[PDB]
């Protein structure tokens, strides 16, 4: 249920995303789209994931589009066109991708179907894993640093490289 | 089967070198070590 | 050493909240064998508590939920 | 009579039956690590029950109003050791470690 | 962390030792060694002055050309001595100072 | 039946990205943004199967892939901007000079 | 959970209270400091001041001016103090006293901290107004940029602790006080502070004199009076911040059972107050930066020290092994 | 003496800021009988489950 | 003559010295007190 | 099949993965292997688990 | 456990009914400057950079000299990268 308001509110807001008029009102909705993907990673239990989706695509990524978009001030006529002609080709690329790509886990992961019987009572507690939990964080930093370091490394190569295409491309010194 | 070739068996002999680093171990041999 | 000194203690109680919730779990598993054997009865093949896994070591029953240990 | 094993009794205790119900909790987590299946650990577990509760009856007979104490402070604080350490050293000096 | 020098590939040539430490590979280098590592540093010192003149920094772009050509000429002669002290390459040399050291 | 749900979010943001693309011929900033949500599902999906497969190989490479979204943001960014510059204008029937 | 709102209520309405009376003592700490005597009519001492200002702003008509983005208009004062109020849920007084005992607590600040920008942005071009755009866009700047400073201080505070539980930050440091080794640290945390609070010496949305007209300079009545509420509630979470990592928390100054007498909810409140009057006294003392120059201290000088801090006190920690 | 007027704001902020801190603890520890425990992990709900059971079904 | 050049660095640029000494001290520690502490440890 | 689990111990799926890896790193026919990759695949997926109790819970609704 | 994120949700909810409540009562009675992009593209970086440190400080117990190391030539790589910012005017707005 839970995950049936969240993928509502998700769906609305990308339809929002993709069809608004003024695309400072789309750069908008797709925060609140990073909102809603932040409290479904809440529910899988990556908190540092959920934070790390608002610190960035918020509060970094989101901001670089909404200061670029907002000075250019877009006047609508050369970004408009009427979409009713576009129904049937959507309807049929959709309905393609919908039937072979929204049902590409049911045969490889058949669901569980919630009997009328407590099947809660059959969960098995381990209590070793229990002594000392580790946090998402904790999980994720044993790792990056160490057994995969490489890739660490080379995503530090592409932040360099957007840094100098940055400055090569945009810059005009005073 | 080249997949029984020793260049495609390195997980297979890597891994047991690492089977007592924390983070990839059973939960027991925490508690009788 | 006051964090080495909690997990110290739950390390010394721990085998007999797991005897007990060992204990709790055969006692659930007879009676969903039961209910299993009750219901399946007339149906021509089945087998009661019949193991999926080829090497017939032992695995927990899953649950259907994706993290139900963080709530 | 006997106390009931709630968490606090148990963590309040922790560090006499760590001390005295070792080798039963040794043998129980051999077995588990040689086997996870619960119906093949049970006599393991019967041993260990036996040894605790023998115990924890035991430590009832010879300190009860400091087991009490430390077993009340422990709850109230959920099982914190730092927020408990005057009745812990009341409980351990009437019934000592050993 | 656990580390393992095994390489796919054996040695053809007999192991005067398996992971040989920095200074004793250094120590390794042979007058071969450092004839390479000369070369690489002058050519690179040459190539920097050349490539330099026409935006006036030869002396500058000398010294640009220099450090990359020491760094990859310590880097190639780190690499023949190592590897011939793991027997990788021929190394009758090491063979002679282990049989009689 | 968690993991379809899950799976079906992940999946209604791809094709929304898909469809972005599909109905905003004039409209090349929203293209832009349209990608951006197409590699969110896809970043959802590594975690979403991480969970699920018990494994932490999804999360490492789920904070590489959002290094790289920022990257490639930003670069887009400033090619948006000299493309801008250049014409005075964002409209698509002043980037359509090399054809045939 | 039917009593969390019990919870949740006794925390924000004395929030309120608090703000309003920040209001009133910095107007009377400026004003004692410049030999008058500030609000001291309306009320006993003034202190009535917040309650008739604050009916007032509730009875003055709202214009919400003709402009084509009239729901994002209302709804920019509305973010930002929903941001300021949220940050608070996370907060600990005392050990306890804390209603969210976030295991990611830390990051869960620093997102907040990166939310705030928006309802500045939105406001400015919401506004339909040139002058309230730029300095919307000057403000965002300057929060974005000081930002990273925050973020790496938090970093250097992280390695000590290495958790991210403010309550465990705070019981970190029973030995000592982070405050004391990590003194310039502090310093650089509270100017951070006060550049992302848009506070004097960083005040551009008061520079009006300046021909620096502000991000809220088309908002009356209740959407102004949100903006503000949200500023000032920021101030007390940055010096409850600059408490919590630095001065112990709720801890006393020496363990001694003297000191141990009085609840650590009092000592967690005389150093959100000791801030909270660096805040007043600093804007009582010198002149403000231009934006130029600010934003060169922020990418110039604080982001290189709070790097070099990370580097320094990282390597220490593990030369010598003292590590968490 | 006069600067003591300027000390009456700034003690109303300390005493909401008190106030903050135990009026939360209080309705707490009174719903829950015990005050709240920092630091609730895996382990400690694990307990109060299973305490549950130990206690009612005894 | 590189001996007044750093002077004029420092004393024209103090936050960027500050902070390049600082950085180095938490790079030289490891780099070298550490494997130190290491070898006296094992003897 | 890394080992690495979300929590810090031992995937679940890890051990049923290298029996199918040690089994498969000497067998010549890969159907020599069948048995132990569809361990591992259970473990990863439990599609045979949840089908056969959407069996018994089919049943319980046709009988009811 | 993310138990404790059920109250920070009802402490949003309760406050956005405050912010209404205060803003609802009163209703009864073509210039692009290139430097704010630059700005954005630096704190995107060094946001990125922050992301990075939390699992690292959180980890050093760990990962010991090793670890400490890798994070050593990461931030060498992104300090190259920002004396090149420093170099070219990116952070002067004058
Ligand atoms: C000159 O700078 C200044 C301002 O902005 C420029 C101020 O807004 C203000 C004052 C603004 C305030 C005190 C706003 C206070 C609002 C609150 C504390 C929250 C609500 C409090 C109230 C008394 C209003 C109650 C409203 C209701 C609808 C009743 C519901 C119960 C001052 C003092 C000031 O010096």
């Given at each position: 249920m839970?995950?049936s308001?969240?993928?509502?509110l998700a ?11 003024n ?6 909705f ?26 960035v ?11 670029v978009?907002?000075?250019?001030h ?7 066109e ?16 919908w ?15 919630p ?34 370091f ?6 530090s190569?592409?932040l360099?490289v ?13 | ?21 924390a ?11 | ?24 779990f ?34 927990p ?11 | 009579?006997?106390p ?10 922790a ?21 996870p299946?619960?119906?093949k650990?049970?006599?393991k ?7 605790v509760?023998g115990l924890?009856?035991?430590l009832?007979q010879?300190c009860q ?7 009340g402070?422990?709850?109230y604080?959920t ?20 | 962390?656990n580390?393992?020098?095994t ?39 040459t190539?920097?002055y ?5 935006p006036?920094?030869?002396?500058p ?7 990359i ?24 040399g090491?063979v002679?100072?282990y049989?009689?050291? | ?25 004039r ?11 197409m ?16 494994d ?5 490479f ?14 887009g960014?400033?090619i ?14 002043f ?6 | ?20 009376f ?22 006993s ?19 919400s ?15 930002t103090?929903?941001?300021?109020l949220?940050?608070?849920?996370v ?25 705030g ?8 071009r ?15 700047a300057q ?17 000590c ?16 006080w ?16 006060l ?10 949305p ?29 101030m ?17 100054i ?27 006294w ?25 790097l ?17 | ?15 909401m ?5 135990n ?16 630091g609730?992990?895996e ?16 | ?18 902070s390049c000494?600082i ?15 290491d ?5 | ?6 929590t ?17 790193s ?10 132990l ?15 056969r ?10 009988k009811? | ?20 409540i205060?803003?609802?009562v009163?209703?009864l ?6 430097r704010?992009?630059?700005?954005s ?19 050093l ?17 992104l ?13 002067d707005?004058?």
């Amino acid at each position: 249920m839970i995950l049936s308001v969240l993928s509502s509110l998700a769906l609305v807001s990308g339809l929002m995303v993709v069809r608004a008029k003024n695309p400072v009102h789309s750069v908008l909705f797709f925060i609140l789209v990073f909102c809603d993907t932040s409290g479904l990673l809440l529910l899988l239990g990556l908190d540092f994931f959920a934070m790390i989706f608002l610190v960035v695509y918020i509060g970094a990524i989101a901001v670089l589009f909404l200061f670029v978009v907002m000075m250019f001030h877009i006047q609508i006529a050369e970004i408009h066109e009427e979409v009713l002609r576009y129904l049937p080709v959507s309807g049929i690329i959709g309905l393609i991708f919908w039937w072979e790509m929204f049902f590409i886990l049911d045969n490889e992961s058949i669901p569980l179907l919630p009997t009328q019987r407590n099947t809660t009572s059959l969960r098995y507690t381990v209590y070793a894993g229990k002594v000392r939990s580790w946090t998402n964080l904790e999980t994720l930093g044993n790792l990056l640093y160490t057994y995969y370091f490489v890739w660490f490394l080379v995503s530090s190569l592409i932040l360099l490289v957007a840094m100098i295409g940055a400055i090569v491309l945009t810059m005009h010194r005073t | 089967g080249f997949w029984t070739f020793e260049r495609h068996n390195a997980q297979l002999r890597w891994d047991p070198q690492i089977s007592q680093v924390a983070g990839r171990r059973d939960p027991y041999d925490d508690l009788l070590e | 050493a006051l964090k080495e000194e909690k997990y110290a203690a739950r390390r010394t109680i721990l085998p007999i909240l797991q005897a007990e919730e060992d204990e709790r779990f055969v006692s659930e598993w007879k009676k969903y064998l039961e209910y299993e054997a009750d219901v399946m009865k007339d149906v021509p093949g089945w087998k009661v508590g019949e193991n999926v896994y080829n090497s017939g070591r032992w695995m927990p029953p899953a649950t259907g939920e994706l993290r139900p240990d963080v709530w | 009579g006997n106390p009931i094993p709630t968490s606090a009794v148990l963590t309040a205790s922790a560090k006499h039956i760590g001390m005295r119900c070792m080798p039963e909790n040794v043998a129980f987590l051999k077995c588990k690590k040689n086997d996870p299946n619960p119906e093949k650990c049970l006599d393991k577990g019967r041993d260990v029950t036996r040894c605790v509760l023998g115990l924890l009856k035991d430590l009832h007979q010879k300190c009860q109003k400091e087991m009490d104490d430390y077993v009340g402070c422990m709850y109230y604080y959920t099982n914190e050791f730092d927020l408990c350490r005057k009745e812990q050293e009341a409980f351990e000096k009437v019934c000592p470690l050993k | 962390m656990n580390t393992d020098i095994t390489a796919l590939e054996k040695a053809q040539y007999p192991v005067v030792d398996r992971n040989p430490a920095f200074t004793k590979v250094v120590g390794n280098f042979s007058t071969l060694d450092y004839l390479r590592f000369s070369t690489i540093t002058g050519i690179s010192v040459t190539v920097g002055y050349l490539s330099g003149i026409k935006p006036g920094i030869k002396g500058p772009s000398m010294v640009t050309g220099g450090l990359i050509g020491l760094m990859g000429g310590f880097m190639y002669a780190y690499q023949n001595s190592a590897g011939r002290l793991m027997g990788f390459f021929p190394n009758d040399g090491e063979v002679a100072s282990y049989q009689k050291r | 039946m968690d993991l379809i749900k899950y799976f079906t979010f992940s999946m209604i943001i791809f094709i929304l990205g898909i469809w972005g693309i599909l109905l905003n011929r004039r409209n090349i900033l929203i293209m832009l943004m349209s990608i951006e949500l197409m590699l969110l599902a896809v970043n959802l999906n590594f975690l979403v199967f991480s969970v699920s497969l018990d494994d932490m190989m999804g999360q490492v490479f789920a904070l590489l892939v959002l290094t790289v979204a920022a990257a490639e943001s930003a670069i887009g960014l400033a090619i948006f901007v000299i493309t801008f510059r250049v014409r005075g204008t964002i409209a698509v029937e002043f980037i359509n000079s090399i054809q045939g | 959970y039917i009593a969390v709102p019990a919870e949740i209520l006794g925390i924000i309405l004395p929030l309120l209270l608090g703000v309003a009376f920040l209001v009133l003592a910095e107007r009377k700490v400026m004003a004692f400091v410049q030999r008058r005597k500030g609000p001291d009519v309306v009320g006993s001492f003034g202190l009535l001041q917040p309650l008739a200002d604050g009916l007032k702003l509730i009875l003055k008509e709202p214009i919400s001016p003709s402009s084509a983005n009239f729901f994002l208009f209302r709804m920019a004062p509305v973010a930002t103090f929903m941001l300021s109020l949220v940050a608070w849920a996370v907060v600990p007084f005392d050990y306890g006293m804390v209603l969210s005992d976030l295991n990611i607590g830390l990051l869960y600040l620093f997102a907040i901290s990166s939310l705030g920008v928006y309802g500045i942005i939105i406001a400015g071009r919401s506004s339909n107004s040139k002058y309230a755009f730029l300095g919307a866009l000057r403000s965002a700047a300057q929060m974005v940029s000081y930002e990273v400073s925050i973020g790496l201080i938090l970093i250097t505070v992280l390695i000590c602790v290495g958790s991210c539980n403010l309550s465990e930050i705070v019981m970190a440091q029973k030995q000592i006080w982070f405050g004391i080794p990590l003194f310039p640290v502090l310093v650089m945390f509270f100017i951070s502070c006060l550049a992302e609070t848009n506070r004097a010496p960083f005040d551009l949305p008061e520079a009006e004199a300046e021909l620096v007209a502000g991000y809220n300079v088309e908002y009356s009545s209740m959407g102004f009076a949100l903006f503000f509420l949200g500023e000032y509630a920021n101030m007390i979470l940055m010096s409850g911040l600059c408490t919590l990592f630095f001065l112990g928390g709720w801890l006393p100054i020496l363990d001694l059972p003297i000191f141990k007498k009085i609840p650590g909810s009092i000592w967690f409140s005389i150093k959100v107050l000791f801030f909270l009057f660096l805040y007043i006294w600093v804007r009582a003392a010198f002149p403000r930066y231009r934006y130029d120059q600010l934003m060169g201290l922020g990418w110039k000088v604080f982001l290189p020290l709070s790097l070099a801090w990370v580097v320094s006190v990282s390597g220490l920690l593990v030369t010598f092994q003292w590590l968490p | 003496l006069v600067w003591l007027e300027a000390m009456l704001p700034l003690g109303i902020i300390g005493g909401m800021l008190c106030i903050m801190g135990n009026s939360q603890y209080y309705i707490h520890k009174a719903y829950h009988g015990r005050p709240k425990h920092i630091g609730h992990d895996e382990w400690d709900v694990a307990m109060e489950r299973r305490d549950k059971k130990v206690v009612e079904k005894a | 003559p590189v001996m007044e050049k750093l002077r004029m660095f420092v004393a024209q640029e103090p936050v960027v010295a500050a902070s390049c000494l600082i950085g180095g001290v938490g790079l030289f520690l490891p780099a070298v007190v550490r494997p130190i502490l290491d070898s006296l440890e094992a003897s | 099949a890394s080992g690495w689990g979300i929590t810090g111990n031992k995937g679940r799926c890890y051990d049923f993965w290298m029996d199918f890896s040690e089994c498969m790193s000497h067998c010549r026919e890969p159907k020599d292997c069948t048995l132990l990759r569809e361990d591992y695949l259970e473990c990863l997926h439990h599609s045979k688990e949840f089908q056969r109790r959407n069996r018994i819970y089919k049943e319980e609704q046709r009988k009811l | 456990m993310m138990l404790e994120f059920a109250p920070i949700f009802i402490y949003l909810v309760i406050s956005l009914l405050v912010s209404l409540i205060l803003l609802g009562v009163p209703f009864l009675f073509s210039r692009f400057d290139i430097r704010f992009y630059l700005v954005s593209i630096l704190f995107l970086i060094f946001d990125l950079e922050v992301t990075f440190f939390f699992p690292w400080a959180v980890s050093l117990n760990k990962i010991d000299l090793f670890g400490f190391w890798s994070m050593m030539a990461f931030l060498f790589i992104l300090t190259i990268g920002f004396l090149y910012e420093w170099k070219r005017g990116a952070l002067d707005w004058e």
